[PDB]
Amino acid sequence: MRELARLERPEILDQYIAGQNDWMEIDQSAVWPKLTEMQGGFCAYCECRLNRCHIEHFRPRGKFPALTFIWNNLFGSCGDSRKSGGWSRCGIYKDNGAGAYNADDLIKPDEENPDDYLLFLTTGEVVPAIGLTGRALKKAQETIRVFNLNGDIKLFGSRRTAVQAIMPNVEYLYTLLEEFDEDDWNEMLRDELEKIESDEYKTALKHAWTF
C-alpha cells in the first residue's frame, strides 16, 4: 500500500452514531471526499482505481464493531456488491472470502508504513520485506493473505503488466548514470516519481523505480 494520511473527519459522520443506527443510515457518498482525497482515488488495500469502490469497515461492525461510525475504521476500499459481480479481492474478499483473520494483525495504511512491510517485485508478486522476523513478518504474510494481493488473477496480472511496461524505461534511465550529472539525474528520478503518482499502482512502480 501507500501511506494514506487519515486527515480530518467529515462532518456528516458525527450526525450518525454506531449502535443507535446502522451504517446504512449515513451516505457513503459523504464519507468519500475525505477517503478519496486521502487515497487520491485509489484503493487503500490493493491500489485498485476507485472505478469499483466502497466504504470498507476495516473492522467489520459484526465482528469488531470498532465504533462503526468512527471515520478511522472507514477506508476508501475497492469493489462493490450492490452492482453484483464476482469480486474476490481486497475489501470485499476480506469480509467474506478470506475468513478467520485477526483485525489487529492487518497492516493499516493510515498509521503503519507498507514500505518496510511489503516488497513489490518486478514479477508482480508482493512478498514480505527483507529482514522481517518473528511477529513483524507475520503481519505482512497475514495482510497479503486476507487482502488477496497475491490471489485473484485480475490484480496480479494487471500489476505485473503495469510493471513490465515501465521496465525498459527504468533500464534506459539507469544506463545514462555517467552520461548525466548528479543533479540532472536526480531531477529525472523526481520526474519519474511524479509520473507514478498519477498512475494506477503507486508503490509497485515506485519499488521498480527506486530502492
Binding site: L121, T123, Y174, T175
Partner: protein, 157 residues
C-alpha cells in the same frame, strides 16, 4: 452456436467470428465460447460473463471491464477468464521471481544461490529466451541501483 471454438486451432479461432460475420452480415449470432482467442475478435459490449453461484443461479449476465477487440490473448486470459499466463503448478514458472528475491536478498548482486538459479534458468529456457533477457535486465537494474545508492549517499551525506 454452442462452443464455437470446438475442434479449432487458435489460428482458426483468430478469424472464425470475422468470417461468419462477413459471410452472414444480417444474422444475429448468439454464440458461447470459452477461448480468449475468439474473444480477442469480439467487442466488449457483445460479451456476457456467466458466473453463477453454488445454486447455478445468476441474475444478470455482465460485460467485462476492459475492451477485448484489440487486446492480446494473454491479457484476455488473465483479466477476463482469471487464468494465469504461466502455469502456477510448475516450479520453472517461478524461477525468475525466486531469482529476483535472491538478488534483492543480498542487495542485488548475483551471489551463489542466485548463480545456481541463473544457470538453472539459462539451461532450461535458453540463451535467447525472454526469461533470460528478464534476468539479465534485472541484474543490470540491481547493479545500476546500487551505484545510484552510492552516488546519492555521496551527494546527501
Amino acid at each position: 452456436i454452442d462452443q464455437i471454438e470446438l475442434h479449432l486451432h487458435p489460428k482458426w479461432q483468430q478469424e472464425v467470428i470475422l468470417n461468419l460475420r462477413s459471410a452472414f452480415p444480417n444474422i444475429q449470432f448468439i454464440i458461447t465460447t470459452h477461448s480468449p482467442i475468439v474473444l480477442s475478435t469480439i467487442e466488449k459490449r457483445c460479451i456476457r460473463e456467466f458466473e453463477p453461484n453454488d445454486d447455478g443461479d445468476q441474475s444478470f449476465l455482465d460485460s467485462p471491464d476492459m475492451q477485448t477487440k484489440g487486446s492480446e490473448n494473454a491479457q484476455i486470459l488473465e483479466q477476463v477468464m482469471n487464468v494465469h499466463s504461466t502455469p502456477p503448478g510448475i516450479a520453472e514458472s517461478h524461477w525468475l521471481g525466486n531469482f529476483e528475491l535472491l538478488l534483492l536478498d543480498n542487495s542485488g548482486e548475483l551471489d551463489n544461490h542466485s548463480q545456481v538459479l541463473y544457470d538453472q534458468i539459462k539451461a532450461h529456457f535458453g540463451i535467447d529466451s525472454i526469461e533470460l533477457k528478464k534476468a539479465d535486465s534485472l541484474i543490470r537494474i540491481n547493479k545500476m541501483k546500487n551505484k545510484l545508492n552510492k552516488i546519492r549517499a555521496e551527494k546527501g551525506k
